């Protein structure tokens, strides 16, 4: 079993030298799920994390104006996959969050360029936050709330590719699912409205160009909002017509879980 371990150790060492870092990132990214202890191995040295963070820092000049290549995007995404590995491990998650590592990813979420290198960079960056929200931790929710991730997700939900829209909606859904999260969004009409308006624009687009995967997350967000009494009275007035119609009835005939959620939403809204 030591042949795998010795290969992992060698690649970890190779991240220190910039001459061997690119190949080491590629090899280690392929083992992000195969090796369960990969995250504490990576976190052990400040040097390994500094090297991964250096890869993120190297593409910040490719933002203004947008000049990112597929090669640049692909290499940084290999380093984001190693950070995602550290974000989701039970031994390293708290330390990753105490080190404010997601903040290094926020400049990538702020980008608006629709070229594939930037859109796929946002997809992978969203994936790191996605892995982090999936852990189902109060510390994660508190971090995301104070660092203003909600506006970043809403922008992507409105203008991103189908996959980026799904991850962004999934992040919002997981924040909404938490009691602190739902209370935060429903605290002011402004915050609720930002969410409701974007969800509404998404329903109108899904009625033109369908996506059952995206619709599943959009409906779950609306259903969670219905649990708050103020959001429920607001939705009685602003809920899109397409959700009360037979608009998605054809598609939802094959998606029982979503059809159930939409039924529970109309039931919550009819008092």
């Amino acid at each position: 079993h030591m042949l795998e371990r010795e290969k992992i150790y060698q690649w970890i060492n190779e991240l220190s030298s910039p001459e061997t870092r690119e190949n080491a990132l590629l090899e280690l990214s392929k083992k992000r799920e195969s090796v369960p202890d990969l995250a504490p191995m990576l976190w052990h040295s400040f040097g390994t994390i500094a090297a991964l963070l250096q890869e993120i820092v190297n593409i910040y000049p490719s933002i203004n104006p947008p000049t990112l290549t597929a090669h640049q995007s692909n290499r940084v995404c290999n380093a984001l996959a190693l950070l995602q590995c550290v974000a989701s491990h039970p031994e390293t998650r708290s330390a990753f969050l105490a080190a404010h590592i997601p903040l290094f990813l926020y400049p990538f979420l702020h980008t608006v360029s629709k070229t594939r290198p930037f859109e796929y960079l946002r997809l992978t960056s969203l994936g790191v936050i996605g892995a982090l929200v999936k852990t189902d931790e109060q510390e994660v929710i508190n971090f995301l709330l104070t660092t203003e991730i909600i506006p970043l997700c809403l922008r992507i939900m409105e203008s991103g590719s189908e996959l980026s829209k799904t991850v962004a909606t999934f992040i919002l859904q997981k924040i909404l699912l938490d009691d602190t999260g739902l209370a935060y969004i429903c605290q002011t009409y402004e915050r609720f409205s930002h969410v409701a308006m974007i969800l509404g624009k998404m329903v109108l687009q899904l009625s033109k160009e369908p996506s059952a995967r995206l619709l599943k997350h959009v409906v779950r967000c609306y259903l969670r909002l219905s649990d708050n009494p103020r959001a429920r009275e607001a939705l009685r007035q602003c809920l899109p017509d397409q959700l009360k119609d037979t608009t998605f009835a054809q598609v939802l005939k094959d998606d029982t879980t979503t059809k159930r959620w939409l039924a529970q939403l109309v039931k919550n809204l009819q008092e």
């Binding site: 597929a70 995404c77 995602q84 997809l123 992978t124």
Partner: peptide, 25 residues
């Protein structure tokens, strides 16, 4: 199965086509 896809795997697929053609040999 909550997401239904792997964001990193989808990135590698999406960029593979562009990486093979973006640099003029």
């Amino acid at each position: 199965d909550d997401l239904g896809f792997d964001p990193f795997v989808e990135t590698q697929k999406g960029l593979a086509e562009l990486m093979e053609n973006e640099v003029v040999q």
